[PDB]
Design a protein around this ligand. Structure first.
Ligand SMILES: CC(=O)SCC[N+](C)(C)C
Length: 286
């Protein structure tokens, strides 16, 4: 190990349902009130306080561990570019990573970026899910290259505006997601996530060096592989079945959710989010 990075007192989080701590719920409630075409209530009835899980997301645990306030801009469905898996949001708000970056910068209205705040980025899953669900054109190698470029551009744009500290999360292991397994798409997920995770850290290391940034890379795939190889160590028992099935329809939730890896068919449980948050916090002093 090298020296721990300096303490963190403010996080700005950008990303998708792996981080969202209430934004998709707030926005969809707004959209429903306004009669927006296509709007639906997200995340749904079988979720904890608007999180796409049964508890806090990894970034919420990271903030708790580190003693930081959290401004969590992440939106369930968010892609790495401007928009969302949920196409019907585009007309109302651009909620992808690039959209969230634009909205954060516009809220600053010329005032300075907090150079001490950690800019946490965790996105790309929906790039893959939209591509598979709506038969996207690109070869997965090209889709991964677009994901990588999008995330690099978000770091560059935040740095441009004055951000100095970043934590960028890798692709998760999409290959073990229950919906991917049920779609017989394990190899395509493997190929997509390997491409993102090989390229992105090399691009971010160059950007870090050029702009004098503090940028930490969190390898979520290494993290999940280690958990899923040694589950008993962490008190996990069921790695594959969702605790709270939703497809084809909502069924009764499992008795022992802290023994389950997956909450629904796409999203991990509060236990896994806890472990992930603790792992992410390990690079920083309290
Ligand atoms: C209830 C669900 O999660 S459906 C899948 C939606 N997703 C593509 C945005 C993850």
């Amino acid at each position: 190990t090298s020296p721990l990075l300096a303490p963190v007192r403010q996080i700005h989080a950008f990303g998708d349902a792996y981080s969202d701590n209430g934004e998709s719920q707030r926005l969809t409630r707004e959209m429903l009130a306004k009669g927006i075409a296509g709007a639906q209530a997200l995340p749904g009835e079988v979720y904890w306080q608007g999180r796409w899980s049964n508890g806090p997301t990894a970034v919420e645990v990271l903030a708790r561990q580190l003693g930081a306030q959290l401004a969590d801009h992440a939106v369930g469905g968010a892609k790495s570019g401007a928009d969302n898996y949920y196409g019907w949001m585009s007309a109302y708000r651009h909620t992808g990573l690039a959209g969230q970056v634009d909205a954060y910068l516009a809220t600053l209205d010329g005032k300075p970026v907090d150079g001490q705040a950690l800019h946490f980025i965790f996105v790309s899953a929906n790039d893959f899910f939209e591509h598979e669900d709506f038969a996207g054109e690109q070869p997965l190698e090209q889709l991964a290259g677009s994901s990588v470029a999008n995330i690099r551009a978000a770091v560059q744009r935040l740095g441009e505006a004055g951000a100095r500290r970043f934590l960028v999360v890798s692709s998760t292991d999409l290959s073990v997601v229950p919906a991917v397994v049920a779609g017989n798409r394990v190899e395509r997920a493997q190929r997509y996530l390997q491409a993102v995770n090989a390229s992105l850290p090399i691009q971010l290391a160059a950007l870090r060096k050029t702009r004098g940034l503090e940028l930490s890379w969190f390898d979520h795939l290494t993290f999940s592989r280690h958990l899923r190889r040694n589950p008993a160590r962490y008190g996990l028992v069921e790695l594959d079945a969702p605790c709270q099935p939703t497809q084809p329809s909502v069924r009764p939730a499992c008795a022992n959710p802290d023994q389950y890896y997956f909450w629904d068919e796409w999203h991990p449980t509060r236990r896994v989010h806890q472990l992930a948050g603790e792992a992410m916090a390990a690079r920083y002093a309290r």
